Amino acid sequence: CTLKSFTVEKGIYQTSNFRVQPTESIVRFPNITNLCPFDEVFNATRFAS
Amino acid sequence: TMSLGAENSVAYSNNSIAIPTNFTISVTTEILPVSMTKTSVDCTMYICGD
Numbered sequence A: 001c002t003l004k005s006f007t008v009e010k011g012i013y014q015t016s017n018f019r020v021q022p023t024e025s026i027v028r029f030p031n032i033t034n035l036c037p038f039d040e041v042f043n044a045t046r047f048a049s
Numbered sequence B: 001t002m003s004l005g006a007e008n009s010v011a012y013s014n015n016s017i018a019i020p021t022n023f024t025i026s027v028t029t030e031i032l033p034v035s036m037t038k039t040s041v042d043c044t045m046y047i048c049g050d
C-alpha cells in the first residue's frame, strides 16, 4: 500500500512509517510565589466613604 | 603578465635529421573519480517533524 499496488517484484523496497503512536500532553511552569495584596483591600476593617 | 613558457626554435633544414641514442623509462600517475556518496531522504520526517 505504499507502492499503491497489489503485486511487488523481487528486490528491496524503502517503505514509509504508517504505524501510529499515541501521545500525551504536558506543561510546566515556575513557582508561583509573589502573590498580590488582595486581603488588605478586600478584608479591611473600615472602608472609606 | 603570465608567461606561456620557455621560448624555443627548432633548427629545421632539409637533408638533416636527428636520431636519439638513449632512452628513459617514466612512471606517471593518473587519478579518476568513480563513485560518490549514496544518500536517502525521508519526506514526511524532514518536512513535518513529529
Ligand SMILES: *[C@@H]1O[C@H](CO)[C@@H](O[C@@H]2O[C@H](CO)[C@@H](O[C@@H]3O[C@H](CO)[C@@H](O)[C@H](O[C@H]4O[C@H](CO)[C@@H](O)[C@H](O)[C@@H]4O)[C@@H]3O)[C@H](O)[C@H]2NC(C)=O)[C@H](O)[C@H]1NC(C)=O
Pocket: A038, A039, A042, A043
Ligand atoms: C478574608 O478573611 C476570611 C477569614 O479570615 C477568609 O476566609 C477564609 O479563607 C480561608 C482560606 O484558607 C478558609 O480556610 C479554609 O477553610 C476550609 C473550611 O471552610 C478548609 O477546608 C480549608 O482547609 C484547606 O486548607 C488548609 C490550609 O489552610 C489545609 O491544611 C487543608 O488540608 C485544606 O486543604 C481552609 O482551612 C476559611 O474557611 C475562610 N473563612 C471564611 C469565614 O470564609 C477570606 O478568604 C479572606 N478574603 C481574602 C480576599 O483574602
Ligand SMILES: *[C@@H]1O[C@H](CO)[C@@H](O[C@@H]2O[C@H](CO)[C@@H](O)[C@H](O)[C@H]2NC(C)=O)[C@H](O)[C@H]1NC(C)=O
Pocket: B021, B022, B023
Ligand atoms: C644511457 O643512459 C644511462 C642512464 O644515465 C647511462 O647509464 C649511466 O652510465 C654511466 C657511465 O657508464 C654511469 O656512471 C651511470 O651511473 C649510469 N646511469 C644509470 C645506470 O642509471 C648510459 O651510459 C647511457 N648510454 C649511453 C650510450 O650514453
Ligand SMILES: *[C@@H]1O[C@H](CO)[C@@H](O)[C@H](O)[C@H]1NC(C)=O
Pocket: B014
Ligand atoms: C634545401 O633548402 C634550401 C633552403 O633552405 C633550398 O634553397 C634548397 O633548394 C633545398 N634543397 C633541397 C634538395 O631540398
